Amino acid sequence: FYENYEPKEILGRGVSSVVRRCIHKPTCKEYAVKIIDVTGGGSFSAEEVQELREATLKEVDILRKVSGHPNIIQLKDTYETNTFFFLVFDLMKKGELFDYLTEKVTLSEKETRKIMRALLEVICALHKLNIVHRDLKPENILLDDDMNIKLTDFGFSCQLDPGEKLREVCGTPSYLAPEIIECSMNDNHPGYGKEVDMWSTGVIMYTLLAGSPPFWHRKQMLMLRMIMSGNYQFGSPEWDDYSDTVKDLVSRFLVVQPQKRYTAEEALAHPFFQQYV
Numbered sequence: 001f002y003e004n005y006e007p008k009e010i011l012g013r014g015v016s017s018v019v020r021r022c023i024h025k026p027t028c029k030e031y032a033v034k035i036i037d038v039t040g041g042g043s044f045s046a047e048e049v050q051e052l053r054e055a056t057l058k059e060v061d062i063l064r065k066v067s068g069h070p071n072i073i074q075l076k077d078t079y080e081t082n083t084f085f086f087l088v089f090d091l092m093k094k095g096e097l098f099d100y101l102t103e104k105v106t107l108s109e110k111e112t113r114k115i116m117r118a119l120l121e122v123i124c125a126l127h128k129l130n131i132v133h134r135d136l137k138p139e140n141i142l143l144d145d146d147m148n149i150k151l152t153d154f155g156f157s158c159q160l161d162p163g164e165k166l167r168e169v170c171g172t173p174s175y176l177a178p179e180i181i182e183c184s185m186n187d188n189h190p191g192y193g194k195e196v197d198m199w200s201t202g203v204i205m206y207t208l209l210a211g212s213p214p215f216w217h218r219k220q221m222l223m224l225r226m227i228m229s230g231n232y233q234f235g236s237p238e239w240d241d242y243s244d245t246v247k248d249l250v251s252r253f254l255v256v257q258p259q260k261r262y263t264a265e266e267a268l269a270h271p272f273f274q275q276y277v
């Protein structure tokens, strides 16, 4: 990696990796490199290190499969050694949607419609290929020069065989679909699928508008109970200025029963996105 790229400053860090800005020596163009330390540390037992190696490979695999979409991050180069993985992506200058939301506090309904439209189009493309992202959140949505969205972080992503379900619990609890929490509680649960992305997308859209999570609590225990029950509300002091149309959309995502939750294709067909037909 270091023979072709000059490593710069840290752009981010993950549980087992570091993301740094870097310069491609030959071209002198800048990129971002996600460096994954497969060996990690203590909890990284003989078996764990391999758990990561295989996961990274899946990540790269998905990346390669979705390469080419205007709003998905583009994997440009990869390198591997007996310890680290080096994924090279185009550099996202305006950073994370999370950072942006941090400054803006909340976003307008028109801006949110801009972002949501692009996001749904991405998820629609991922779902069309039977790929579940499993980590849809503001932190994994980056921004380019023109403030256009770029979905990143396919570290928990999986391309599913027809009818294949998942059972592992991974991702930020606040964005976890009820099915994921259910599954962890009971082994006799049918596992989960793509629909989890749609719940996450719901949490996201809500937070963009409200500047806060639909579900939250001091104790994770009750927070999860809230998610499971789907007990969230359009807070009286915030949601006043937004149209009911957006509130109908948000509510169609936050549906505890996967089978009755909106799909990306349905979401995009909702009134909220039909002004110029």
Ligand SMILES: Nc1ncnc2c1ncn2[C@@H]1O[C@H](COP(=O)(O)OP(=O)(O)OP(=O)(O)O)[C@@H](O)[C@H]1O
Pocket: 011, 012, 013, 014, 015, 016, 017, 018, 019, 032, 034, 073, 089, 090, 091, 092, 093, 095, 096, 139, 140, 142, 152, 153, 154, 155
């Ligand atoms: N192409 C990019 N351009 C700009 N900076 C980026 C890029 N990709 C990642 N970063 C930054 O690094 C952070 C981590 O990237 P990424 O989400 O892939 O890491 P991770 O270790 O998988 O994350 P997590 O801890 O959520 O699992 C991002 O949130 C972002 O701030």
Ligand SMILES: [Mn+2]
Pocket: 014, 139, 140, 153
């Ligand atoms: Mn991430």
Ligand SMILES: [Mn+2]
Pocket: 014, 135, 153, 154, 155, 156
């Ligand atoms: Mn990740």
